Ligand binder design. Sequence first.
Ligand SMILES: *[C@@H]1O[C@H](CO)[C@@H](O)[C@H](O)[C@H]1NC(C)=O
Length: 219
Amino acid sequence: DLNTEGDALYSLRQSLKDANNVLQSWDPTLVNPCTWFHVTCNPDNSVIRVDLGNAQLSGALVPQLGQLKNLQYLELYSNNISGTIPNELGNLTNLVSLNLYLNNFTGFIPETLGQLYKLRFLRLNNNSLSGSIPKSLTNITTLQELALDTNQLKSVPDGIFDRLTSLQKIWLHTNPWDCSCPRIDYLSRWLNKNSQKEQGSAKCSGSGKPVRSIICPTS
Ligand SMILES: *[C@@H]1O[C@H](CO)[C@@H](O)[C@H](O)[C@H]1NC(C)=O
């Protein structure tokens, strides 16, 4: 009997590159992947977290990774994972923490990420993600820590942070933010009103000014 979770997890092994045989224990012919290293399962023998931080992994992620229904912690930080973030990651309903920082992800941030209504920690920092931040992120009301620094983000949809009443920390620095008025109006005012939330200082592209300092005139 094929475990389906291990099958989905084996699809990830088939595309990644070790180079260290970190995934040597990932044998899908077993009854379940709960005895796999870097993999924890619940008492119902279902994968609830994947810890592959600092494993020197190359390659791209797979759409099969969204098959893990009971996944809570996806730790893929500190690797050389390239390509775009799969939209199927928005299927991870029970995902609490998505750690994808320190990789080489490109493209846009998936709008399907807003379907993660249990997500409390989202770290996509230190990548090459281009703007802008998905509008559906406003639906993640449980979001507490949002790390998006060190990317290529340019803008923000107006009023996106307003429904985020559980937001504690937010990283936005090191990004080519478009500080042209009236586009930067909302982000400038929000970061000023929630300066205790912003970790580091988001700079404006070109001028290098903190966007919190920008005051857009009307007419
Ligand atoms: C996974 O998400 C994609 C959207 O990116 C969707 O088309 C697909 O049906 C989802 N799969 C499951 C099993 O929910």
